[PDB]
Design a protein around this ligand. Sequence first.
Ligand SMILES: CN(C)c1nc(=O)n(-c2cccc(NC(=O)COc3cccc(-n4c(=O)nc(N(C)C)c5ccc(Cl)cc54)c3)c2)c2cc(Cl)ccc12
Ligand SMILES: C[S@@+](CC[C@H](N)C(=O)[O-])C[C@H]1O[C@@H](n2cnc3c(N)ncnc32)[C@H](O)[C@@H]1O
Ligand SMILES: C[S@@+](CC[C@H](N)C(=O)[O-])C[C@H]1O[C@@H](n2cnc3c(N)ncnc32)[C@H](O)[C@@H]1O
Lengths: 380, 380
Amino acid sequence: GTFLFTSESVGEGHPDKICDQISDAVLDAHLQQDPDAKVACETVAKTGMILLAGEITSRAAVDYQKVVREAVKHIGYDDSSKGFDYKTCNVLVALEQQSPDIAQGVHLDRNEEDIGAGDQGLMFGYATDETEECMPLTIVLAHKLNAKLAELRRNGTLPWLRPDSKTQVTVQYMQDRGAVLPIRVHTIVISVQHDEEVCLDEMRDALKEKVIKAVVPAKYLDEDTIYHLQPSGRFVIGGPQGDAGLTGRKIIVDTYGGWGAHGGGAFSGKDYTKVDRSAAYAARWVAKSLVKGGLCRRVLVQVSYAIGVSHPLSISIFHYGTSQKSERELLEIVKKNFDLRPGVIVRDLDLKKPIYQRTAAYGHFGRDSFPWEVPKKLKY
Amino acid sequence: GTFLFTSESVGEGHPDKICDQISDAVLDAHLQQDPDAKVACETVAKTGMILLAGEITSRAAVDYQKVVREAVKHIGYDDSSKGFDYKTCNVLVALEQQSPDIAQGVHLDRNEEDIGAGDQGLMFGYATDETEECMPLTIVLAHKLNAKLAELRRNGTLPWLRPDSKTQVTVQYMQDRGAVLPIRVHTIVISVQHDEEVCLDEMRDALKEKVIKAVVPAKYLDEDTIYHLQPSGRFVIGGPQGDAGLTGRKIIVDTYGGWGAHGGGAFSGKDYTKVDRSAAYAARWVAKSLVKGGLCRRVLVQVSYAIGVSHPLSISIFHYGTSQKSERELLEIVKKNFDLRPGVIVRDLDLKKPIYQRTAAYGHFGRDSFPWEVPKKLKY
Ligand SMILES: CN(C)c1nc(=O)n(-c2cccc(NC(=O)COc3cccc(-n4c(=O)nc(N(C)C)c5ccc(Cl)cc54)c3)c2)c2cc(Cl)ccc12
Ligand SMILES: C[S@@+](CC[C@H](N)C(=O)[O-])C[C@H]1O[C@@H](n2cnc3c(N)ncnc32)[C@H](O)[C@@H]1O
Ligand SMILES: C[S@@+](CC[C@H](N)C(=O)[O-])C[C@H]1O[C@@H](n2cnc3c(N)ncnc32)[C@H](O)[C@@H]1O
């Protein structure tokens, strides 16, 4: 009854993640001045270039050059030796107003609570009791390995590190009546951009001793564990110079690491009226409320919308066999306890607050007691 | 024990799908001349602009202006009145060689069968017996609604239609020992860009009578079915002018419409050495082979890779309770029947053939008897 499951994560300097962080720096800059900004900011990154493309209608006055360059500086791309420099890169802007046809169909002359969804689409929330934060262990560990690399880069412990990294964790699980229990780490991958001088053996030793052993409990590592550390052999070229990045190309890293399900929408660069983000956050909040409320050990929630319509078109629950209550009964508890209109989710989850850049690396879920991570006390 | 499930699809002129089709037009143009081209072509679209960004190492001589404009012409964006015109748009190119550090770690001086995965990552395959093609009914119907809009646009039936469209289908299902059986269509959304002259009532009537009734069997539609037809009320501005598009932002439309699982990787613009595409195609082939072989009614397959390593790091099977065989026994049948190294998948699935633009609208799976849709006869 044991099985393997694999999740990945990427670091703050992975080029896709650069784009998510910049898109959310732009969103936060707008929301600091105009809580009702309509923002749909995509970012593209390639050698020497950040391009902003999309639609923003806002009363804010935002200095895009400053906002983009400060985000890149924070990530750590500050010199041509590293492949990218916030001081000297090109910042190109192709931003227009929100389509008036979308505005009139979504929010023009609507009561806030009765604002339409900003698009159609489907969204999922997931929670699992295998960790306190109700996240899969594979993705938590993958994120923490990237965070550890950034910590050792920033504290000068491993000064050959650059910001672009990827990690991947395969866990052997057992099943218990549809719940899952981690047993051991079967395989770890780490790839991280590095300077021209450090040798492979020095990097592999440091990644095992100072990264993996610092993050992963010894009880999960044994003589069988497989390590793929700098498996390409050389990763000097990195960041956007090694690989073009785009906003919304890490949607599985952003959510559950492959567990549960995904409706396809990207989070970063979008205000609350874009249900791709707000309804996925609300669905996480529902799922985590069901698990912390003791109604199931793990659960998947689907919701869906039509553009211009406030109430969800569908709400669905899958409990993997981990509840005494039927999925019908759980769906009735959800409908009695939650209002998933976007103009209500914004109030419950405080989604005009400019905290979005903080969500755009290391996953949107399972961290920092954001509002969607604080369970609602359920009445039934 | 009934439940709702929702999937969406988008049309050929949805701005994200424009980008996927251009990325794959570029890939095909390279493969026509150099079957071993290394291609990683991202496309971005906004008003008046197609930008290509990424990495290509190829012996081909490709006219990017011609390839991009021909793809946009095929989609139907041929006049400023429609919001985009292949004849007059800007085509910008930011394409460099493949990173030499990736090349040396993946494929340089490797036997083809023993080429390394072109990246780490995780990928899933899915199949379900609810349709002959082993796809979920929700996503099949959503795709066919977009195809019907394009057909009636191209045959001049509904000359007010433009290429940008979205559809969404919610089906009520029953469960039968982990298999799922569609009962009825609960809700349909259609949004499609249109000309300045046609009125809402004319469009809603046509969408119901000439689109929905042409596609969806009457046995699924009843007095309760909910229709959201042009729910925004106005969609004259569309294509990249209404919404920026990027390659790899429709990964759930490309796969199973939310069913099964997704590892996060985009398909379009990538040659076979990028396991995001080749291993997802191979995992579909495995899943469909298990269902057509009578071993399960539905099944999810996970695989994962490390950059530079040929064999998968993990392979996993979830049969939703729909097999007499254990998931362990199914995994042993998979391992005895399939070799999921990328340099073997390329031979089994013929992945140097320039047919990729054909995959880049209406889903990659369940259509046209591509190699990954032809089940393998299993020995066990
Ligand atoms: C009620 N009914 C029948 C419904 N059926 C449905 O399929 N979905 C539904 C629809 C769309 C998508 C998904 N996505 C997933 O739940 C499947 O997802 C994953 C992902 C990642 C891992 C696993 N998974 C895993 O979790 N456990 C495993 N164990 C414990 C063996 C496992 C083993 C191997 C593998 Cl490859 C995967 C495994 C499974 C489910 C429903 C959704 C709703 Cl909201 C309501 C009702 C249903
Ligand atoms: C392998 S690249 C994707 C394929 C690439 N576009 C190509 O042209 O082959 C994806 C990610 O892997 C990482 N990467 C880049 N160069 C790498 C290298 N030399 N070794 C390992 N990983 C690398 C970076 O995080 C990058 O964003
Ligand atoms: C609603 S837009 C995403 C949000 C948009 N970026 C914004 O600025 O609000 C997503 C997709 O919906 C469709 N769309 C565009 N304008 C629309 C309209 N007026 N009514 C309905 N759907 C529309 C197009 O397919 C577009 O690519």
